[PDB]
Amino acid sequence: MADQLTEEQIAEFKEAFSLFAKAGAGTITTKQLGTVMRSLGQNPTEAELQDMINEVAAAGAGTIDFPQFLTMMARKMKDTDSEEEIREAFRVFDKDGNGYISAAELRHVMTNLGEKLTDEEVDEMIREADIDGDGQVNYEEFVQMMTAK
Amino acid sequence: TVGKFYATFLIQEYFRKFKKR
Ligand SMILES: [Ca+2]
Ligand SMILES: [Ca+2]
């Protein structure tokens, strides 16, 4: 099942994971894992790595293959289709048709579904987000503030 | 039915959550 995906990564990703070790090749071990993941580029905290290295292990040794190595690093960013989906919702929110949500619009979505939600939370939300000092929020800050947890 | 139903699932979750102060 193809769905379009970057390539520059898979290219360099394999290279590093391919050129390394010494007594053999094909896969890396816990220790070698970090080594390859390090030269790879980014160098965030080591916590995430630790857990993973111990999570991949399962019915077998600690040697990891390249296919699983990329899947993990790739999953780190979390892959989930949500483009058009959010776009559609964008139209439902905005009423003027543009690239910036306004209070009036936001309130509309609320009062519509009901759930009370007085106009108090609305102004409060704008005070929390808002990239600039504008009583409006761009599609970016909008999506960046959406998807909670 | 793949449609706007999904949009609700999203706006719904975020709402019920950020609800409290
Ligand atoms: Ca607007
Ligand atoms: Ca803004």
PDB file of C-alpha atoms and ligand atoms in Angstrom:
ATOM      1  CA  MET A   1       0.000   0.000   0.000  1.00  0.00           C
ATOM      2  CA  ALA A   2       1.727   3.159  -1.199  1.00  0.00           C
ATOM      3  CA  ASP A   3       0.802   6.602   0.098  1.00  0.00           C
ATOM      4  CA  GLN A   4       3.753   8.817  -0.810  1.00  0.00           C
ATOM      5  CA  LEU A   5       6.599   9.285   1.654  1.00  0.00           C
ATOM      6  CA  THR A   6       9.904  11.120   1.957  1.00  0.00           C
ATOM      7  CA  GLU A   7      12.939   9.479   0.350  1.00  0.00           C
ATOM      8  CA  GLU A   8      15.981  11.520   1.315  1.00  0.00           C
ATOM      9  CA  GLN A   9      15.672   9.902   4.730  1.00  0.00           C
ATOM     10  CA  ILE A  10      15.424   6.262   3.708  1.00  0.00           C
ATOM     11  CA  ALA A  11      18.515   6.997   1.634  1.00  0.00           C
ATOM     12  CA  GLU A  12      20.788   8.345   4.356  1.00  0.00           C
ATOM     13  CA  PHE A  13      19.098   6.246   7.031  1.00  0.00           C
ATOM     14  CA  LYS A  14      20.181   3.029   5.334  1.00  0.00           C
ATOM     15  CA  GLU A  15      23.685   4.293   4.582  1.00  0.00           C
ATOM     16  CA  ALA A  16      24.621   4.832   8.228  1.00  0.00           C
ATOM     17  CA  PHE A  17      22.821   1.679   9.342  1.00  0.00           C
ATOM     18  CA  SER A  18      24.609  -0.156   6.530  1.00  0.00           C
ATOM     19  CA  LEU A  19      28.167   1.100   6.934  1.00  0.00           C
ATOM     20  CA  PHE A  20      29.225   0.159  10.456  1.00  0.00           C
ATOM     21  CA  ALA A  21      29.943  -2.750  12.787  1.00  0.00           C
ATOM     22  CA  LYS A  22      32.958  -4.862  11.864  1.00  0.00           C
ATOM     23  CA  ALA A  23      32.647  -8.557  12.657  1.00  0.00           C
ATOM     24  CA  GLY A  24      29.619  -8.551  10.367  1.00  0.00           C
ATOM     25  CA  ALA A  25      26.689  -6.514   9.076  1.00  0.00           C
ATOM     26  CA  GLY A  26      22.949  -6.660   8.377  1.00  0.00           C
ATOM     27  CA  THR A  27      21.799  -5.556  11.825  1.00  0.00           C
ATOM     28  CA  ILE A  28      22.974  -3.620  14.885  1.00  0.00           C
ATOM     29  CA  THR A  29      22.849  -4.371  18.613  1.00  0.00           C
ATOM     30  CA  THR A  30      21.584  -2.273  21.555  1.00  0.00           C
ATOM     31  CA  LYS A  31      24.924  -0.486  21.818  1.00  0.00           C
ATOM     32  CA  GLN A  32      25.483  -0.230  18.081  1.00  0.00           C
ATOM     33  CA  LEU A  33      21.887   0.951  17.871  1.00  0.00           C
ATOM     34  CA  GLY A  34      22.620   4.245  19.599  1.00  0.00           C
ATOM     35  CA  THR A  35      25.851   4.597  17.634  1.00  0.00           C
ATOM     36  CA  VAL A  36      24.016   4.473  14.316  1.00  0.00           C
ATOM     37  CA  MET A  37      21.087   6.492  15.660  1.00  0.00           C
ATOM     38  CA  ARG A  38      23.586   9.118  16.795  1.00  0.00           C
ATOM     39  CA  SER A  39      25.458   9.754  13.563  1.00  0.00           C
ATOM     40  CA  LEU A  40      22.054   9.668  11.904  1.00  0.00           C
ATOM     41  CA  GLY A  41      21.763  13.344  12.867  1.00  0.00           C
ATOM     42  CA  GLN A  42      19.376  14.579  15.572  1.00  0.00           C
ATOM     43  CA  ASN A  43      20.544  13.981  19.137  1.00  0.00           C
ATOM     44  CA  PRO A  44      17.640  14.535  21.529  1.00  0.00           C
ATOM     45  CA  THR A  45      17.507  13.023  25.009  1.00  0.00           C
ATOM     46  CA  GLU A  46      18.731   9.482  25.634  1.00  0.00           C
ATOM     47  CA  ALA A  47      15.617   8.462  27.555  1.00  0.00           C
ATOM     48  CA  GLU A  48      13.495   7.788  24.474  1.00  0.00           C
ATOM     49  CA  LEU A  49      16.271   5.597  23.085  1.00  0.00           C
ATOM     50  CA  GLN A  50      16.778   3.542  26.246  1.00  0.00           C
ATOM     51  CA  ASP A  51      13.125   2.529  26.518  1.00  0.00           C
ATOM     52  CA  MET A  52      12.870   1.613  22.833  1.00  0.00           C
ATOM     53  CA  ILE A  53      16.056  -0.466  22.758  1.00  0.00           C
ATOM     54  CA  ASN A  54      14.501  -2.521  25.550  1.00  0.00           C
ATOM     55  CA  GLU A  55      11.044  -2.512  23.972  1.00  0.00           C
ATOM     56  CA  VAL A  56      12.016  -3.922  20.578  1.00  0.00           C
ATOM     57  CA  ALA A  57      13.485  -7.057  22.136  1.00  0.00           C
ATOM     58  CA  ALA A  58      11.045  -9.936  21.699  1.00  0.00           C
ATOM     59  CA  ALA A  59      11.448 -13.655  21.042  1.00  0.00           C
ATOM     60  CA  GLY A  60      15.038 -13.270  19.855  1.00  0.00           C
ATOM     61  CA  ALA A  61      18.327 -11.487  20.525  1.00  0.00           C
ATOM     62  CA  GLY A  62      18.821  -7.719  20.749  1.00  0.00           C
ATOM     63  CA  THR A  63      20.008  -7.414  17.147  1.00  0.00           C
ATOM     64  CA  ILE A  64      17.717  -5.053  15.222  1.00  0.00           C
ATOM     65  CA  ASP A  65      17.222  -5.093  11.453  1.00  0.00           C
ATOM     66  CA  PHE A  66      17.216  -2.006   9.222  1.00  0.00           C
ATOM     67  CA  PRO A  67      13.473  -2.317   8.350  1.00  0.00           C
ATOM     68  CA  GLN A  68      12.523  -2.133  12.027  1.00  0.00           C
ATOM     69  CA  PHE A  69      15.110   0.567  12.687  1.00  0.00           C
ATOM     70  CA  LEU A  70      13.491   2.959  10.236  1.00  0.00           C
ATOM     71  CA  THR A  71       9.977   2.044  11.301  1.00  0.00           C
ATOM     72  CA  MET A  72      10.809   3.089  14.849  1.00  0.00           C
ATOM     73  CA  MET A  73      12.543   6.363  14.058  1.00  0.00           C
ATOM     74  CA  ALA A  74       9.729   7.044  11.616  1.00  0.00           C
ATOM     75  CA  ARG A  75       7.058   6.253  14.182  1.00  0.00           C
ATOM     76  CA  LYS A  76       8.713   8.661  16.593  1.00  0.00           C
ATOM     77  CA  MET A  77       7.114  11.430  14.564  1.00  0.00           C
ATOM     78  CA  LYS A  78       3.841   9.509  14.566  1.00  0.00           C
ATOM     79  CA  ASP A  79       2.279   9.028  11.136  1.00  0.00           C
ATOM     80  CA  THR A  80      -1.415   9.845  10.826  1.00  0.00           C
ATOM     81  CA  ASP A  81      -3.458  11.145   7.908  1.00  0.00           C
ATOM     82  CA  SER A  82      -5.280  14.273   9.038  1.00  0.00           C
ATOM     83  CA  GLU A  83      -4.907  16.817   6.245  1.00  0.00           C
ATOM     84  CA  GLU A  84      -8.149  17.102   4.287  1.00  0.00           C
ATOM     85  CA  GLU A  85      -9.928  15.975   7.434  1.00  0.00           C
ATOM     86  CA  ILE A  86      -8.862  19.075   9.342  1.00  0.00           C
ATOM     87  CA  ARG A  87      -9.367  21.176   6.224  1.00  0.00           C
ATOM     88  CA  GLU A  88     -13.027  20.271   6.072  1.00  0.00           C
ATOM     89  CA  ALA A  89     -13.403  21.237   9.713  1.00  0.00           C
ATOM     90  CA  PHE A  90     -11.677  24.517   8.913  1.00  0.00           C
ATOM     91  CA  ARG A  91     -14.532  25.536   6.647  1.00  0.00           C
ATOM     92  CA  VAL A  92     -17.062  24.502   9.272  1.00  0.00           C
ATOM     93  CA  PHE A  93     -15.367  26.841  11.728  1.00  0.00           C
ATOM     94  CA  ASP A  94     -14.542  29.900   9.650  1.00  0.00           C
ATOM     95  CA  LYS A  95     -17.479  31.727   8.053  1.00  0.00           C
ATOM     96  CA  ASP A  96     -15.767  34.368   5.947  1.00  0.00           C
ATOM     97  CA  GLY A  97     -13.529  31.925   4.090  1.00  0.00           C
ATOM     98  CA  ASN A  98      -9.831  32.669   4.535  1.00  0.00           C
ATOM     99  CA  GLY A  99      -6.826  31.481   6.553  1.00  0.00           C
ATOM    100  CA  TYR A 100      -7.469  32.709  10.093  1.00  0.00           C
ATOM    101  CA  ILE A 101     -10.044  31.784  12.732  1.00  0.00           C
ATOM    102  CA  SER A 102     -11.909  34.633  14.450  1.00  0.00           C
ATOM    103  CA  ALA A 103     -13.855  34.789  17.714  1.00  0.00           C
ATOM    104  CA  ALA A 104     -17.239  35.113  16.014  1.00  0.00           C
ATOM    105  CA  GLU A 105     -16.488  32.011  13.976  1.00  0.00           C
ATOM    106  CA  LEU A 106     -15.204  29.997  16.929  1.00  0.00           C
ATOM    107  CA  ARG A 107     -18.281  30.867  18.979  1.00  0.00           C
ATOM    108  CA  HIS A 108     -20.483  29.748  16.099  1.00  0.00           C
ATOM    109  CA  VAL A 109     -19.071  26.229  16.245  1.00  0.00           C
ATOM    110  CA  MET A 110     -19.693  26.180  19.980  1.00  0.00           C
ATOM    111  CA  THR A 111     -23.198  27.628  20.284  1.00  0.00           C
ATOM    112  CA  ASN A 112     -24.122  25.423  17.340  1.00  0.00           C
ATOM    113  CA  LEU A 113     -23.432  22.037  18.924  1.00  0.00           C
ATOM    114  CA  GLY A 114     -24.625  23.593  22.182  1.00  0.00           C
ATOM    115  CA  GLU A 115     -22.719  22.273  25.193  1.00  0.00           C
ATOM    116  CA  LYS A 116     -23.301  25.669  26.776  1.00  0.00           C
ATOM    117  CA  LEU A 117     -19.727  26.912  26.566  1.00  0.00           C
ATOM    118  CA  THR A 118     -20.377  30.594  27.179  1.00  0.00           C
ATOM    119  CA  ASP A 119     -18.352  33.191  25.297  1.00  0.00           C
ATOM    120  CA  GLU A 120     -15.987  33.181  28.263  1.00  0.00           C
ATOM    121  CA  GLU A 121     -13.901  30.212  27.168  1.00  0.00           C
ATOM    122  CA  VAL A 122     -13.666  31.679  23.682  1.00  0.00           C
ATOM    123  CA  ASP A 123     -11.815  34.809  24.753  1.00  0.00           C
ATOM    124  CA  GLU A 124      -9.808  32.676  27.162  1.00  0.00           C
ATOM    125  CA  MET A 125      -8.634  30.398  24.368  1.00  0.00           C
ATOM    126  CA  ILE A 126      -7.494  33.363  22.299  1.00  0.00           C
ATOM    127  CA  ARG A 127      -5.480  34.580  25.277  1.00  0.00           C
ATOM    128  CA  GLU A 128      -3.688  31.246  25.559  1.00  0.00           C
ATOM    129  CA  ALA A 129      -2.777  30.818  21.895  1.00  0.00           C
ATOM    130  CA  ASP A 130      -2.307  33.572  19.313  1.00  0.00           C
ATOM    131  CA  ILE A 131       1.147  33.797  17.749  1.00  0.00           C
ATOM    132  CA  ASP A 132       1.080  37.552  17.430  1.00  0.00           C
ATOM    133  CA  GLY A 133      -0.887  40.187  19.314  1.00  0.00           C
ATOM    134  CA  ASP A 134      -3.914  39.645  17.058  1.00  0.00           C
ATOM    135  CA  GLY A 135      -7.366  38.711  18.344  1.00  0.00           C
ATOM    136  CA  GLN A 136      -7.205  36.080  15.588  1.00  0.00           C
ATOM    137  CA  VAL A 137      -5.339  32.795  15.099  1.00  0.00           C
ATOM    138  CA  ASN A 138      -3.758  31.442  11.897  1.00  0.00           C
ATOM    139  CA  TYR A 139      -4.403  27.945  10.573  1.00  0.00           C
ATOM    140  CA  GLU A 140      -1.010  27.038  12.008  1.00  0.00           C
ATOM    141  CA  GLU A 141      -1.457  28.074  15.632  1.00  0.00           C
ATOM    142  CA  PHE A 142      -4.954  26.667  15.227  1.00  0.00           C
ATOM    143  CA  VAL A 143      -3.853  23.151  14.379  1.00  0.00           C
ATOM    144  CA  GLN A 144      -0.861  23.503  16.677  1.00  0.00           C
ATOM    145  CA  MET A 145      -3.222  24.186  19.571  1.00  0.00           C
ATOM    146  CA  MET A 146      -5.712  21.512  18.531  1.00  0.00           C
ATOM    147  CA  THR A 147      -5.270  17.738  18.973  1.00  0.00           C
ATOM    148  CA  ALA A 148      -5.064  17.513  22.762  1.00  0.00           C
ATOM    149  CA  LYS A 149      -4.320  14.490  24.933  1.00  0.00           C
TER     150      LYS A 149
ATOM    151  CA  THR B   1     -20.155   6.863   6.636  1.00  0.00           C
ATOM    152  CA  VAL B   2     -16.921   8.684   5.865  1.00  0.00           C
ATOM    153  CA  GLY B   3     -18.053  12.313   6.034  1.00  0.00           C
ATOM    154  CA  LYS B   4     -18.267  15.102   8.610  1.00  0.00           C
ATOM    155  CA  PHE B   5     -18.840  12.597  11.405  1.00  0.00           C
ATOM    156  CA  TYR B   6     -15.082  12.493  11.854  1.00  0.00           C
ATOM    157  CA  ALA B   7     -14.769  16.253  12.210  1.00  0.00           C
ATOM    158  CA  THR B   8     -17.082  16.014  15.194  1.00  0.00           C
ATOM    159  CA  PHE B   9     -15.030  13.306  16.863  1.00  0.00           C
ATOM    160  CA  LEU B  10     -12.140  15.760  16.891  1.00  0.00           C
ATOM    161  CA  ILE B  11     -13.803  19.032  17.887  1.00  0.00           C
ATOM    162  CA  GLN B  12     -15.758  16.987  20.407  1.00  0.00           C
ATOM    163  CA  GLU B  13     -12.790  15.534  22.272  1.00  0.00           C
ATOM    164  CA  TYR B  14     -10.879  18.818  22.499  1.00  0.00           C
ATOM    165  CA  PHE B  15     -14.010  20.552  23.794  1.00  0.00           C
ATOM    166  CA  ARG B  16     -15.030  18.212  26.616  1.00  0.00           C
ATOM    167  CA  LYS B  17     -11.378  18.383  27.715  1.00  0.00           C
ATOM    168  CA  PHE B  18     -10.312  22.037  27.640  1.00  0.00           C
ATOM    169  CA  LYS B  19     -13.723  22.592  29.215  1.00  0.00           C
ATOM    170  CA  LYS B  20     -12.436  22.877  32.781  1.00  0.00           C
ATOM    171  CA  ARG B  21     -10.218  25.858  33.552  1.00  0.00           C
TER     172      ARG B  21
HETATM  173 CA    CA C   1     -12.097  33.639   9.485  1.00  0.00          CA
HETATM  174 CA    CA C   2      -2.517  34.658  16.188  1.00  0.00          CA
END
